């Protein structure tokens, strides 16, 4: 994955040069920003099942025809898969928050997303809706620094979907 310290290390290695003041300043900034990010991680940790169920039912509201037989949303196992996917997304968002960046998120979902979307006809608009619901409800779950940074992670994932 790619966390600010990792880019710092790799870049310093590129030019074959030791670290400097700027990258240590960036590492410092990561260090203080971690605490609100860690709090956001806790908040999303204890709300996981509610997150998943709310996102799935929001998808129901905006896309009920999907649940119609002969389509993707139809089927109890299909919906178990929907919830499992959304839970994976939220777990990787937690990893992103704790990472002070989008490294693990990119590596584990964004690498190869549209390909599988085409493969199983997985419309990215579904997950855009799910993460928009997650954004709206985190508008209540969190506040301030953690809220804003978790929002930026979620909407970065959204823009990657779009």
């Amino acid at each position: 994955s790619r966390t600010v310290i990792t880019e710092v290390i790799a870049t310093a290695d590129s030019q074959g040069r030791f670290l400097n003041s700027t990258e240590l300043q960036a590492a410092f900034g990561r260090f203080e920003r971690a605490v609100p990010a860690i709090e956001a991680a806790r908040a999303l940790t204890k709300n996981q099942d509610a997150l998943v169920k709310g996102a799935v039912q929001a998808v129901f509201k905006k896309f009920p025809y999907v649940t119609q037989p002969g389509e993707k949303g139809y089927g109890d196992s299909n919906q178990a898969k929907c919830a499992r996917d959304i839970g994976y997304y939220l777990r990787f968002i937690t990893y992103s928050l704790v990472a002070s960046g989008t490294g693990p998120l990119d590596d584990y979902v964004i690498a190869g997303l549209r390909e599988v979307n085409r493969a199983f006809n997985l419309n990215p608009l579904w997950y855009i809706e799910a993460l928009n619901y997650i954004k709206g409800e985190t508008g209540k779950l969190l506040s301030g620094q953690s809220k804003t940074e978790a929002l930026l992670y979620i909407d970065h994932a959204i823009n990657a979907l779009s």
């Binding site: 966390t3 990792t6 030791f18 670290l19 990561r30 605490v35 704790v98 490294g103």
Partner: protein, 172 residues
Amino acid sequence: MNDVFTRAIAQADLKGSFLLESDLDKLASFAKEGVKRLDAVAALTNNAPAIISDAAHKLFAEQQELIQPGGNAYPHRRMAACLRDMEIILRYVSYALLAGDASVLDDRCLNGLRETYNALGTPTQSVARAVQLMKDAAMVHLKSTANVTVGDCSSLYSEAATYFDKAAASIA
């Protein structure tokens, strides 16, 4: 490329579960003391030319079979390679410290360097001795607290010492 935090996320995904509470508390504790590690590597970097100069000086003090003809470092090019070798060793261990993990150090230096030196004819124990002189000079310059606020950094000293230890073990 992986750090201890990244490896923690790696096991989190290996079990597929979210980041725990206790380990993330450990990560928060690491984040608050990240300034300590930054200061430690800053002392490494500022004193890096001095550290390498002193370690090399004592190195050629103890060993003399290298400066003589047929020595592993006789021509200017060979001992130049030697010098930049210690330089790279210390640099990669500093990278490992910032990561807190030797996986970057392993992937960079220790994937294939030992057999490289075997092919070159370079003896490993000489490089390990150089590494230990590196740690002597490094701890000398780092355990000094000049121009910085004083605090407990025994964990940082131990981490750097252990990283040189595993480097020496890998090479020899």
